[PDB]
Amino acid sequence: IRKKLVIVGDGACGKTCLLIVNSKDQFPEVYVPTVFENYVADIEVDGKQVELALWDTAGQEDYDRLRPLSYPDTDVILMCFSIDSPDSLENIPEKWTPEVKHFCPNVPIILVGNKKDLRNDEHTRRELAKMKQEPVKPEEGRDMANRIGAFGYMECSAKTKDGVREVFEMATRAALQ
């Protein structure tokens, strides 16, 4: 059984790390932005062997002309933001949801809050407080998921591995529905 997952969301919000930890089981140490790449994850869910194609994309607005090449025949969208970036959450309804709803009508969206480990990181909190902001709270992520009509909301950290397997299990269930 073959299904296609596309991941989108702001530049540097943790998309590639999420995909790599899920598949290769190892956190990448390079700081390198993605243009496009494809991976495969074999996942068994509810007795079914799924070959899940993972399409990785660039979050930079510069790539807005190219990103739609990824969208055809998509079965599930992971729409990501970073917990350490309230701006990346605000960009969910302002930019990502309009694009995904346009090119992926009626495809289930999992809203994913990345870098959960930074929510209480002292450096992060002080950097955000300087700018009158704070890390995204769980209720805020959930509220946004409800607002955009997501299939679910999940938080994860690619760095600690927390929540990662659960993101892709949920995504696979959504893809099979």
Partner: protein, 192 residues
């Protein structure tokens, strides 16, 4: 007084650049090299929209108080709205072939002859801009934005194929375009 979406010669009296474009390049030269992930980390879209509206109105703007990521994004948006792109879509096939030329001097010579075919205003802006990116790349051990990283993050705002082409064509060469822009960032002092 509209700023975006117009060729550079037509917004530049005697090829003098618009002040808000110069101001943006100045703050990015000043603050950019100290900012982790500059050009890569996405800015607040609503903030960008608001700044762009202000600039396109010719209304009064205090760029020292704007987020540096907002400045970076709005600059790239300005570039992305130059009809034909700042490198000229008409020259796209030549730009994508530059990195096939032999050694570094031959590459430089090919690029210089292509820059010669661009409007003067374009080249003045490109001088400013590749200088800023060179400065940023010089501090990559701090800010993580190597020449390659910067090239990936800015290339599609600098060059794209003629309007008649498919997005597949752009996708075919987008890696080559980033490798060209990486070369220009690294060598910009031998080039301009």
């Amino acid at each position: 007084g509209q700023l975006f979406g117009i060729s550079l010669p037509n917004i530049c009296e005697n090829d003098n650049l618009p002040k808000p474009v110069l101001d943006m390049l100045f703050f990015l030269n000043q603050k950019g090299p100290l900012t982790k992930g500059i050009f890569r980390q996405s800015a607040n879209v609503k903030s960008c929209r608001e700044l762009k509206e202000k600039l396109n109105s010719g209304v009064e703007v205090h760029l020292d108080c704007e987020s540096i990521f907002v400045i970076a994004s709005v600059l790239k948006d300005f570039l992305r709205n130059i009809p034909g792109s700042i490198f000229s879509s008409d020259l796209y096939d030549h730009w994508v072939s530059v990195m096939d030329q032999g050694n570094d001097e031959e590459k430089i010579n090919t690029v210089q002859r292509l820059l010669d075919q661009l409007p003067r205003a374009n080249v003045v802006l490109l001088r400013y801009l590749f200088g800023v990116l060179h400065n940023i790349e010089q501090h990559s051990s701090s800010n993580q934005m190597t020449a390659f990283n910067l090239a990936v993050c800015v290339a599609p705002s600098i060059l794209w194929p003629p309007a008649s082409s498919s997005p597949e064509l752009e996708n075919e060469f987008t890696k080559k375009v980033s490798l060209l822009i990486q070369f220009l960032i690294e060598n910009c002092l031998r080039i301009f």
